[PDB]
JSON list of C-alpha atoms in Angstrom, two decimals:
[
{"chain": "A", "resi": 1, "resn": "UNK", "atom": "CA", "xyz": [64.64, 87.44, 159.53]},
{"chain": "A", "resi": 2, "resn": "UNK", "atom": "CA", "xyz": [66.12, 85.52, 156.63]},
{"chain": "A", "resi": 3, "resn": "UNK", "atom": "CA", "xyz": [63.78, 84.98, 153.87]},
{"chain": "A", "resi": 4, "resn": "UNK", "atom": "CA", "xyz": [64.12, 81.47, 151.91]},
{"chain": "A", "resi": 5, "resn": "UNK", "atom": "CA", "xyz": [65.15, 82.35, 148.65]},
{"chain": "A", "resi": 6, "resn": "UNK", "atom": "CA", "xyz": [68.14, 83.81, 150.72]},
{"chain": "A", "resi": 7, "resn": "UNK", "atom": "CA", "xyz": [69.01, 80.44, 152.61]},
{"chain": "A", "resi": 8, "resn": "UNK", "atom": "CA", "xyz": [68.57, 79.16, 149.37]},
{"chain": "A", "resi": 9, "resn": "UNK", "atom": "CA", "xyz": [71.26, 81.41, 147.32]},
{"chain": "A", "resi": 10, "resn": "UNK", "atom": "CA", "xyz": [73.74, 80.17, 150.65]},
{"chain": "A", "resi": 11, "resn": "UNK", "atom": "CA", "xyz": [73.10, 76.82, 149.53]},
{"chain": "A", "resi": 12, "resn": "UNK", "atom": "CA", "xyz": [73.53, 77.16, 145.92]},
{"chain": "A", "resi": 13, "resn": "UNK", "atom": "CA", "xyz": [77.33, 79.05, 146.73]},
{"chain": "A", "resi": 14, "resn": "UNK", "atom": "CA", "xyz": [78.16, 76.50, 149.20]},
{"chain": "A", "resi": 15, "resn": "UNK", "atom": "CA", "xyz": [77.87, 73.89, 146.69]},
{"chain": "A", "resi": 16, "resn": "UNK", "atom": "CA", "xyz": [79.54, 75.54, 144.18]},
{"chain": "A", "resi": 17, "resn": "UNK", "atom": "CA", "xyz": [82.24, 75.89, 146.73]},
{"chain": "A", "resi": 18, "resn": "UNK", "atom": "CA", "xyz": [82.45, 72.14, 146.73]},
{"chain": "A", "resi": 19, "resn": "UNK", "atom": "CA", "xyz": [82.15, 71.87, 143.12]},
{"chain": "A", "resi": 20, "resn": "UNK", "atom": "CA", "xyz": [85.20, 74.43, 142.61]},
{"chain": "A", "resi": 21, "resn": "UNK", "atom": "CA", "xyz": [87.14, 72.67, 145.25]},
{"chain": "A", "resi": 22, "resn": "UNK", "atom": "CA", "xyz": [87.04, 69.30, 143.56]},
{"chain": "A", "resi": 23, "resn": "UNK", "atom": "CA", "xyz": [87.81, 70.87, 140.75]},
{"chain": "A", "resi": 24, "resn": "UNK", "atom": "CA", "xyz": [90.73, 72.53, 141.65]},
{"chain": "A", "resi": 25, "resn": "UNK", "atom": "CA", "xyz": [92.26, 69.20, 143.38]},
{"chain": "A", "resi": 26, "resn": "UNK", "atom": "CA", "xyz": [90.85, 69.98, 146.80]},
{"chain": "A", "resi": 27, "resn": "UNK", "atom": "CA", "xyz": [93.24, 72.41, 148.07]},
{"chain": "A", "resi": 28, "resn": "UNK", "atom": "CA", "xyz": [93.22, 76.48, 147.88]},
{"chain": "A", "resi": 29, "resn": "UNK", "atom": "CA", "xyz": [94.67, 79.14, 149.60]},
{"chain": "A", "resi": 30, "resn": "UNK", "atom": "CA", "xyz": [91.38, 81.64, 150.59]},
{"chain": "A", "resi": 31, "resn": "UNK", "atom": "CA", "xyz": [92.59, 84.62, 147.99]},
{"chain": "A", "resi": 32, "resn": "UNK", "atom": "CA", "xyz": [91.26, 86.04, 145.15]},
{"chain": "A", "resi": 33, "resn": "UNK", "atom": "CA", "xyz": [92.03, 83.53, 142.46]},
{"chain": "A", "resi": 34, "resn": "UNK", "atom": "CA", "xyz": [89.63, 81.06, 144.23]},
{"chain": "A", "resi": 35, "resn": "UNK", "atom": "CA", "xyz": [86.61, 83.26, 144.54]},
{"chain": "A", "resi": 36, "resn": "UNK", "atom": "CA", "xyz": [87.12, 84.47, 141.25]},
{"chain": "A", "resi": 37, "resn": "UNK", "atom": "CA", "xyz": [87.35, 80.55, 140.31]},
{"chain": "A", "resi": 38, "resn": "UNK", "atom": "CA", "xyz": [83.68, 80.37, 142.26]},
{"chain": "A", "resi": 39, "resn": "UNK", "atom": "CA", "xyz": [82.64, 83.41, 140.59]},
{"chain": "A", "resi": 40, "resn": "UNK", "atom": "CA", "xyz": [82.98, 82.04, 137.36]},
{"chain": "A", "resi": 41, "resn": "UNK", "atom": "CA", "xyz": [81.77, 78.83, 138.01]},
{"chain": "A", "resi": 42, "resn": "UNK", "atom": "CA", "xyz": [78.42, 80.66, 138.76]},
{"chain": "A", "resi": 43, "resn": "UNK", "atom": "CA", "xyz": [78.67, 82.24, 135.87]},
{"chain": "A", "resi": 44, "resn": "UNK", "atom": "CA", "xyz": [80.01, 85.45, 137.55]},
{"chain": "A", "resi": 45, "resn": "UNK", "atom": "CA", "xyz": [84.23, 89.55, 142.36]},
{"chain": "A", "resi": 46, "resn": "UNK", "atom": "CA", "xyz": [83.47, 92.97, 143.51]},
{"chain": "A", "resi": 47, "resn": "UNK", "atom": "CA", "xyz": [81.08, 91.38, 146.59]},
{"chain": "A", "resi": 48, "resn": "UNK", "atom": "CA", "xyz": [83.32, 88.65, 147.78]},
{"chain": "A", "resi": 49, "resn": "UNK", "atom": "CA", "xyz": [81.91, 89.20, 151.58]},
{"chain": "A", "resi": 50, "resn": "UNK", "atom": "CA", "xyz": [78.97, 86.95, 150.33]},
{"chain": "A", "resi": 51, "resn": "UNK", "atom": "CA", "xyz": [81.04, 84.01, 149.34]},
{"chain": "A", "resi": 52, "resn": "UNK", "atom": "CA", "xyz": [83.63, 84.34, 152.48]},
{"chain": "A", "resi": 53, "resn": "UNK", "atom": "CA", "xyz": [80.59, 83.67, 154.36]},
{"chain": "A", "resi": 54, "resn": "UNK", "atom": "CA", "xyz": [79.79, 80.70, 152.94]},
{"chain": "A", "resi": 55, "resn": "UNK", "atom": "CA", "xyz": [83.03, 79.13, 152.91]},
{"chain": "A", "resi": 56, "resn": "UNK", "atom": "CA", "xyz": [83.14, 79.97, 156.92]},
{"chain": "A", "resi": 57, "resn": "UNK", "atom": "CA", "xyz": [79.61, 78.52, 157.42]},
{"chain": "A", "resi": 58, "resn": "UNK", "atom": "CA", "xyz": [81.45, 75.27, 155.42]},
{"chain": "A", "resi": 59, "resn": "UNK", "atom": "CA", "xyz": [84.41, 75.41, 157.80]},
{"chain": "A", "resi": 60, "resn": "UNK", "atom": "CA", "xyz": [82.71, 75.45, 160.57]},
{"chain": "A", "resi": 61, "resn": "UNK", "atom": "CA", "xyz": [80.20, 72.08, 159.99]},
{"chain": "A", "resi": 62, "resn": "UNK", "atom": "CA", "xyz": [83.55, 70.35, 158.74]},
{"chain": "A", "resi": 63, "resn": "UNK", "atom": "CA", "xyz": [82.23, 70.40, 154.96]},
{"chain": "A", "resi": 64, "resn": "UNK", "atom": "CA", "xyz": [85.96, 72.02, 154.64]},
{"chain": "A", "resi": 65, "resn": "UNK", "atom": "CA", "xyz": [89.09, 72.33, 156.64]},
{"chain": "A", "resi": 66, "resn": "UNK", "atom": "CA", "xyz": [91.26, 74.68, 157.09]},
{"chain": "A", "resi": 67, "resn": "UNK", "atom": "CA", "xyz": [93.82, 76.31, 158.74]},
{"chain": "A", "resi": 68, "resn": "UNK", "atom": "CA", "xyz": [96.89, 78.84, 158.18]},
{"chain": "A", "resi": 69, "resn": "UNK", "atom": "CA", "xyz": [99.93, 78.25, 156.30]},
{"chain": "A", "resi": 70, "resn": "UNK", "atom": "CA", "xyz": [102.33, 79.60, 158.76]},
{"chain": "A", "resi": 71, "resn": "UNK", "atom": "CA", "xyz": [105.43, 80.02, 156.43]},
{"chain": "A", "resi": 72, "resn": "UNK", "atom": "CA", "xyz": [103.45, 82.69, 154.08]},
{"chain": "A", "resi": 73, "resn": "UNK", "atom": "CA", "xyz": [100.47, 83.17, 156.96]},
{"chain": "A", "resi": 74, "resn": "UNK", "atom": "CA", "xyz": [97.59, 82.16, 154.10]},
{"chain": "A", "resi": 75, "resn": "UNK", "atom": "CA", "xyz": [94.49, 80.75, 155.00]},
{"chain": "A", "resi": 76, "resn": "UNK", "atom": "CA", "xyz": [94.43, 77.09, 153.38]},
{"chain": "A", "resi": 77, "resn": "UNK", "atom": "CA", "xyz": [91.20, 75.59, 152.95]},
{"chain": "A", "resi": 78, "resn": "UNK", "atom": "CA", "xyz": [90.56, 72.39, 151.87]},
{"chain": "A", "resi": 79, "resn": "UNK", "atom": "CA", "xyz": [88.58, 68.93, 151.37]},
{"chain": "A", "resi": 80, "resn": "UNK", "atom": "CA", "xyz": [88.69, 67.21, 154.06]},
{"chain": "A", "resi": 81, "resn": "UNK", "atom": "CA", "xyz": [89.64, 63.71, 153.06]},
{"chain": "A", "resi": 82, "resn": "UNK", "atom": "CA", "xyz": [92.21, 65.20, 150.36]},
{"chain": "A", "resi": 83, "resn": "UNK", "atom": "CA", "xyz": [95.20, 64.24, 152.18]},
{"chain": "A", "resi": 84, "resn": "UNK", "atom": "CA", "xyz": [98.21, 65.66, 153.59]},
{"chain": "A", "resi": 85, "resn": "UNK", "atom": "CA", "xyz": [100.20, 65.16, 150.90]},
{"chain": "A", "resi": 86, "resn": "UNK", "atom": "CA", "xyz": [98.45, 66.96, 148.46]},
{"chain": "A", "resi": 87, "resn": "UNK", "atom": "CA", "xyz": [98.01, 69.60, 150.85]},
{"chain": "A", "resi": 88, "resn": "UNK", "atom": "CA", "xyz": [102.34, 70.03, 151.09]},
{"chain": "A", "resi": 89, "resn": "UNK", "atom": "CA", "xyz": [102.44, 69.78, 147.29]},
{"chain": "A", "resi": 90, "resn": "UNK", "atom": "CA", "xyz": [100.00, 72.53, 147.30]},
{"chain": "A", "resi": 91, "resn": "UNK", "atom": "CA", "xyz": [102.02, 74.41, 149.86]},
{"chain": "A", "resi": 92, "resn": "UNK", "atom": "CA", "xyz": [105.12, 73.86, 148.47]},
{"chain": "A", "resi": 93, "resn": "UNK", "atom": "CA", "xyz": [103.93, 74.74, 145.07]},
{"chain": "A", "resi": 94, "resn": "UNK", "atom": "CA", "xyz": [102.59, 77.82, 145.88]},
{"chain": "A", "resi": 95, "resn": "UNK", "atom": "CA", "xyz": [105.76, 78.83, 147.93]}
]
């Protein structure tokens, strides 16, 4: 039984996921430098569970996409609209 203040905290780090990932140019692999990039957004990554679930509950109502980078085998998330390109500059950058 989920109490609302709860619900509430899951809404407040979902949109600081969005936040971040405008932010950050709409593409990040799923990895420590991006939760410590929402962590510190929030004002501050020992938890990290708590966020994770978040950005799943995102992925999974289309708020974000994602899928794995198959090269490396990352997890790329991203906004949806951001476009391919920038997600192969990402990609490549990060190679």
């Amino acid at each position: 039984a989920m109490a609302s203040a709860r619900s509430l905290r899951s809404l407040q780090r979902q949109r600081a996921i969005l936040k971040v990932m405008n932010t950050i140019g709409g593409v990040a692999y799923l990895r420590e430098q991006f939760y410590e990039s929402v962590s510190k957004y929030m004002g501050s990554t020992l938890d990290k569970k708590t966020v994770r679930g978040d950005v799943d509950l995102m992925v999974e109502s289309e708020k974000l996409g994602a899928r794995t980078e198959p090269v490396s085998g990352r997890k790329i998330i991203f906004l949806p609209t951001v476009g391919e390109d920038a997600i192969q500059r990402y990609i490549l950058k990060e190679k």
